[PDB]
Design a protein around this ligand. Sequence first.
Ligand SMILES: CCN(CC)c1ccc2cc(C(=O)N/C=C\N3C(=O)CCC3=O)c(=O)oc2c1
Ligand SMILES: CCN(CC)c1ccc2cc(C(=O)N/C=C\N3C(=O)CCC3=O)c(=O)oc2c1
Lengths: 405, 396
Amino acid sequence: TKPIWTRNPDDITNEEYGEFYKSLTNDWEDHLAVKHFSVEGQLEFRALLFVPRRAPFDLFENRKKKNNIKLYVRRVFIMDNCEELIPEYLNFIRGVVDSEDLPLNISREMLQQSKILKVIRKNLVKKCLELFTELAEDKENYKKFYEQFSKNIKLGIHEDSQNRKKLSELLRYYTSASGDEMVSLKDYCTRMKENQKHIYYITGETKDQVANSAFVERLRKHGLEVIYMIEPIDEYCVQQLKEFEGKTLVSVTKEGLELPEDEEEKKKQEEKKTKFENLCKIMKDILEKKVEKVVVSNRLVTSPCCIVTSTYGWTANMERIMKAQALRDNSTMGYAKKHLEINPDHSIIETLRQKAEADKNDKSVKDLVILLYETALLSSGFSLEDPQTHANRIYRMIKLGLGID
Amino acid sequence: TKPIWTRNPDDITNEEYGEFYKSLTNDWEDHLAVKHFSVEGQLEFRALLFVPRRAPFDKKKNNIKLYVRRVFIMDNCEELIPEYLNFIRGVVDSEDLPLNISREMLQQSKILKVIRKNLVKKCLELFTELAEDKENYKKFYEQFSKNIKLGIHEDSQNRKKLSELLRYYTSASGDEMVSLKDYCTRMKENQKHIYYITGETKDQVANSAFVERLRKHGLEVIYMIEPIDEYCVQQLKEFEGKTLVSVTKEGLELPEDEEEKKKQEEKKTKFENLCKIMKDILEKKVEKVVVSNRLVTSPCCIVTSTYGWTANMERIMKAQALRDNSTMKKHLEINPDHSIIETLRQKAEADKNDKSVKDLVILLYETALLSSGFSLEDPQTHANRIYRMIKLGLGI
Ligand SMILES: CCN(CC)c1ccc2cc(C(=O)N/C=C\N3C(=O)CCC3=O)c(=O)oc2c1
Ligand SMILES: CCN(CC)c1ccc2cc(C(=O)N/C=C\N3C(=O)CCC3=O)c(=O)oc2c1
């Protein structure tokens, strides 16, 4: 009688859909979700789409399967891999597309097919984003989905600038407040204190490393929520996600960390600015060019120091990923400028300011400046120049802790 | 009027060779080296082989054009040459092999197996020739060092002839690369082992902790900085009788001393108390804690089990496991003659529940992992521990 995608959506049982999706992809378990829609107008076409349970494989990047949408015209099969029928970041969708009107045999000149496809393209991506917007309403079944295709969503953020807002509403992250849960961007905004003009994120490799890192200290004490961006995609994602609902994004690993001045803590921070600037310009010289600037931390509580990164430059996470990639492709590392922030109110920083402003030539002072700098790189997610150099330096500091002999 | 490979070699100008290799591979510069040979016997066939100057970017198993009685057949010939020689370009003109076969007539594979084994011999002949001019072999090993080490891994029958062609940086060779036969000439007749280290840069392995008592003892250590080496040594057991030992692995055998081992034995039992304590302070963070016989300036180091993943291995594999996202044995050696070990034995045997002792054992263990090429559990945890130790260096 009629093919399965011509019967209309609410007249089909979810198991009938599944038997079809199994027969279409040989997947051993049924579909996860289904969107099934038709279109009339200048163009008549139907479309049945499936989202597999287990995220498909990355396919050699061969790009030899831009998609797996079986393509029909007037109920006859045509192609299996239709390059411009679906944007690359939705290639996991399985299903069929049955057009009534598109032109098949075409030369270069007949761009009309490429118009019909572009409109079907936008209509297919629209009905998908609709389905994901639908899925986001049941919080704990959307979990089975974002678990598999989070990497896919973030890719769209980078490529499809036209749908960037609708896509960003679908992102979920770990934050400081959501101790064990993932939360939307709209939720983080509902918990913002007014006059906070920024959304705080940190990029590392594990939650425990970014949660207990040095960079977030005076931000968690300040009652602020910070977003944990742990997957390597995130480093590229934020590069094109400028703002959400008006508020701009800021990295807690970068210099110039803006915070709300209350009862002009800038006046106390300014006294610290000038009080320790002596110590600032000394360690800049003890280190020479291993660092670019030495400034007073406005973000450090329990740790004495941290290594922050240039504003318009690579980060510790990026520097790790890129150079972990340059192992794979045999290459010189080629051509990341760091800033070191010191906590004025820490005893090690206070006591160091005394020994240094008394005798800045003391080889013990030089040794301690280098040592704190090296451990700060460890805190900030970097790799050391020469590990045994730091090792011998720690051994010397241990010699000082107990009997020097 | 006659094809170029059937013409007798030494009647061939190197420009004719180069012009031909250009016409065969469109390479803009001439060949690097050429081996050209014929064979008679049960099988008659000729072969002209080229080594390109620039190492190519390697599913085309090789580019050896294959002729029979001077007629072309195919170029991608899978079982004509082992995979680690895919950079060879050239032609092979057989007189007798059978092309059309029923799967039963594997006799087609015998003729190929014979040409295969015969081709690899004439190549290793060429490479042994190249090893004689030191600073031109460098132009080659610079490009194909990776290839030779792969052959060590795969071709066990030619494993010996290949190792003779390996070149490395060592402690003695400050800037030059040296053969294995040379390292044997500098061995003491009481030395039964060849010492190597696996790292990432020459500068890091030369100043490493594992080699301390080896440069003081007048011993030479081989610097393996390329990642292939990690797999190379897994199949490179011995050269010229003397076996290889990794300075990152446990059970470091050394030339037995003038019965001074009794002093190493007194150190063994004297610090064994501290060994039992640090073993428990680090709850399964390490597998065993024993007395070092290899450390001079460093107080402690982390070696790996003989059969386990090397320190190098765990770094590379987990650096690659960023691709899969798949996310996946240690020994702690302490230096007896170091003051920090003596002082720790005293603080431990006086009050072994001192949190300063706990702070010191954990701190020493973590920095030793850094010394040994590992990654830290929680960097901010180690940092807070150092900040605590620095706070102790001066008043709290
Ligand atoms: C119908 C016979 N031939 C020529 C061999 C085909 C078959 C398929 C296609 C697909 C094309 C094409 O549009 N590619 C880009 C997007 N795309 C579609 O819109 C459908 C399939 C597909 O890959 C095309 O331009 O010519 C084609 C020509
Ligand atoms: C021209 C006829 N065609 C190919 C279309 C051939 C040509 C060559 C071969 C070689 C075979 C063969 O002997 N393979 C074993 C070794 N071998 C070669 O000698 C060349 C490639 C290769 O794998 C074969 O099984 O079928 C062939 C079929």
